[PDB]
Design a protein around this nucleic acid. Structure first.
Ligand SMILES: [Zn+2]
Length: 680
RNA sequence: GACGUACGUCG
RNA sequence: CGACGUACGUCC
């Protein structure tokens, strides 16, 4: 509530009617500086002119907090603040709420949707565009689209009372620049995209920064590897047997994915199996039943190989027991999903060696040196200080569950409550966690929880706690991710342990350490410039980028007027012709076919939440002998309960030429599409 | 459905 | 220098 000289010095360039980029690594300092600039911008207008400052937020956990803070702050001045969101807009007159409201905190995508639809024609209605974490203004971001609209209005010739852009952040970022010659080009490109002339950064009051932003130290502790690989050998033998079984039916299983000699347990093998699955998914034979059985067997074999490779990666990055539990969970999930000959044979071949797998996993001499060093450093830090609230980052979510189970079931360490924290992630399956559950887990992080397993969700702006220990367990990021993960240690005395087996992530961290100093030197060089030359440079860059954007403008190619039959992938059963495909909002594709209504079963959706204008109703699945394949969703548009299918889980087949093709996104699949009319 | 990041594979 | 795959995260 009391503005100090530190956070007041960052407001001097902003309180001059010029576009600035404030860079403060502090959490509360950034929002406090935004409040000070809002106060100075709403108290400087003469009598009879009101302000329409607009704060932006990319996430709901940061949007709700900023809305609460703004509502608590602008209560003694008489300023209306409501804010808009994905859930707040229950058919809300956005035009009326923007015309009546003073401080709007809508998340960007709403403003982009409004600018694309026609509501709020120009941004001249606003007078101060505040961006939170403006470093995310990368290629085709929502922030980037708002700034594209702003630059178009500025350079076209219809230049009106344009608003001020004071986009806040904590690190400008470098991207893929190697030398200082490009670390400045990237920052100038970012400043031109955000249309700013000054980079606000403290140069006088470094004492407050050094005293309240106490930063941890790096403890790169590379460890041993899987020299003891009895589990890996058994899984590799099983993978070789199932690969030979898959080659028994498919002769040419080597010229479909010509990449390199595949190696069991690597990402290369995952890419190889995905490529061979997508190549054998279109194997056509003029029988329509034997080809269907062949594609089914090949899909089952490729899925089993992918699951075995994932289990090998989990066994390499954690205990063998959790990888065996993951394999058993997959086999139990496919057990209740229909007993055909292929899955039966595979399950029998698995249970043949399941006893040896359980024995080798229960063998207490096969503990991973990664986990040994992890528990060793954990007990070391907890003996040095019993009250140390730590946080570790893990790449995979199955690996996160594995680490949680390992911290739970361990006799050596039993003073840790492994509170899981993954996030929403993909809103289609039973995985991830809800926002009200994540909020409760973060609020119980004072306290009945000390350790927690995160997947790059720990940072991302969202407020946390005073964590005095970070462990990047087989984790690696770029300069912005490293600065965000480093800033989480703010209390007096912290560490940033990095455990790994591959020297690659060590080299990445070592070059990011130099990239941070390069970004600091580039920011200093850009600050020690002149306003006129820098404005001319950013104007030249904006003109060049606008010319490139206007050049790269292709509405759509010619639509092929044919009647293709979208049919299943793993079953190859004719689902529906492309004639019965209706476009809802140039995003979603539905089917009206009465004959199609008997070719799919429905299941209760695991996580309901309405997006845009679709109530999150049931999930569809293929209806056949034994398919159980995901086909999309079945939702109510406004009053009609129609199924929206996903092209990703659908192989295309033309009746004329007879060749099969694959398409991942609906945008890529080009065909004569008619809008969805509420007639049938 | 859109967007970003990381790792990786091909020319 | 472009295409792609996986994982992760966010939004509508
Ligand atoms: Zn099917």
């Amino acid at each position: 509530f009391k503005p100090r000289n530190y956070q007041l010095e960052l407001a001097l360039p902003a309180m001059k009617g010029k576009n600035t980029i404030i860079c403060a690594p502090t959490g509360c300092g950034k929002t406090f500086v935004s409040l000070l600039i809002c106060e100075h911008h709403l108290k400087k207008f003469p009598q009879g002119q009101k302000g329409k400052v607009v704060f932006f937020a990319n996430q709901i956990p940061v949007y709700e907090q900023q809305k609460s803070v703004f509502s608590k702050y602008f209560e003694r001045h008489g300023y209306r603040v409501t804010g808009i969101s994905g859930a707040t807009a229950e058919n809300v007159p956005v035009e009326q709420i923007v015309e009546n409201n003073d401080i709007i905190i809508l998340t960007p995508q709403i403003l982009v949707n409004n600018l694309k639809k026609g509501t709020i024609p120009s941004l001249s209605i606003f007078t101060l565009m505040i961006f939170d974490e403006c470093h995310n203004t990368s290629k085709q971001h929502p922030y980037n689209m708002i700034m594209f609209n702003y630059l178009d209005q500025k350079l076209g010739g219809s230049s009106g009372p344009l608003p001020q852009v004071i986009g806040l952040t904590a690190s400008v970022g470098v991207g893929d620049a190697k030398n200082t010659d490009e670390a400045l080009d990237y920052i100038c490109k970012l400043c031109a995209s955000l249309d700013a002339s000054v980079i606000a950064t403290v140069k006088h009051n470094l004492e407050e920064l050094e005293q309240v932003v106490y930063k941890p130290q790096k403890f790169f502790r590379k460890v041993e590897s899987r020299i003891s690989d009895k589990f890996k050998y058994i899984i590799a033998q099983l993978m070789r047997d199932t690969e030979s079984l898959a080659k028994r039916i498919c002769k040419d299983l080597e010229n479909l994915s010509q990449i390199q000699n595949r190696e069991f347990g690597t990402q290369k093998y995952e890419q190889w199996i995905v490529t061979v699955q997508k190549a054998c998914m279109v194997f056509q034979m003029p029988d329509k039943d034997e080809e269907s059985r062949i594609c089914k067997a090949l899909f089952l074999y490729t899925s089993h190989l992918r699951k075995y490779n994932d289990a090998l990666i989990i066994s390499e990055h954690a205990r063998m027991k959790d990888a065996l539990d993951y394999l058993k969970d997959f086999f139990s999930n496919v057990r209740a999903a229909g007993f055909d000959e292929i899955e039966q044979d595979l399950t029998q071949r698995f249970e043949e060696k399941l006893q040896e797998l359980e024995s080798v996993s229960r063998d207490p001499s096969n503990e991973n040196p990664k986990l040994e060093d992890l528990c060793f450093i954990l007990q070391e830090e907890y003996h040095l200080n019993p009250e140390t609230i730590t946080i570790l980052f893990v790449k995979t979510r199955a690996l996160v569950d594995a680490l949680k189970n390992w911290i739970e079931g361990n006799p050596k360490l039993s003073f840790l409550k492994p509170g899981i924290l993954t996030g929403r992630g993909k809103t289609n399956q039973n995985t991830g966690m809800t926002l009200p559950a994540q909020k409760c887990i973060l609020d119980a992080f004072k306290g009945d929880h000390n350790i927690l397993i995160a997947t790059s969700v720990a940072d991302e702006g969202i407020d946390i706690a005073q964590c005095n220990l970070v462990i990047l367990y087989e984790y690696v990021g770029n300069v912005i991710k490293m600065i965000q993960t480093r800033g989480r240690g703010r209390a007096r005395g912290s560490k940033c342990f990095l455990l790994t087996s591959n020297a690659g992530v060590i080299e990445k961290e070592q070059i990011n350490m130099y990239k941070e100093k390069m970004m600091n030197d580039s920011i200093l060089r850009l600050q020690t410039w002149d306003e006129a030359v820098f404005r001319e440079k950013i104007l030249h860059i904006q003109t060049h980028e606008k010319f490139i954007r206007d050049s790269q403008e292709k509405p759509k190619p010619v639509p092929d007027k044919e009647n293709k039959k979208l049919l299943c992938r793993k079953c190859k059963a004719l689902a529906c012709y492309t004639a019965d495909v209706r476009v809802i909002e140039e995003c979603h594709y539905t089917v009206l076919g009465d004959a199609f209504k008997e070719c799919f079963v429905s299941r209760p959706h695991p996580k309901p939440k309405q997006f845009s204008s679709f109530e999150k109703r049931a999930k569809i699945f293929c209806a056949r002998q034994n398919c159980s394949h995901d086909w999309g969703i079945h939702v109510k548009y406004k009053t009609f309960e129609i199924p929206v299918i996903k092209i990703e889980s659908f192989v295309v087949e033309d009746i004329a030429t007879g060749v099969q093709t694959l398409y991942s996104k609906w945008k890529d699949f080009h065909f004569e599409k008619i809008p969805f009319d509420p007639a049938e």
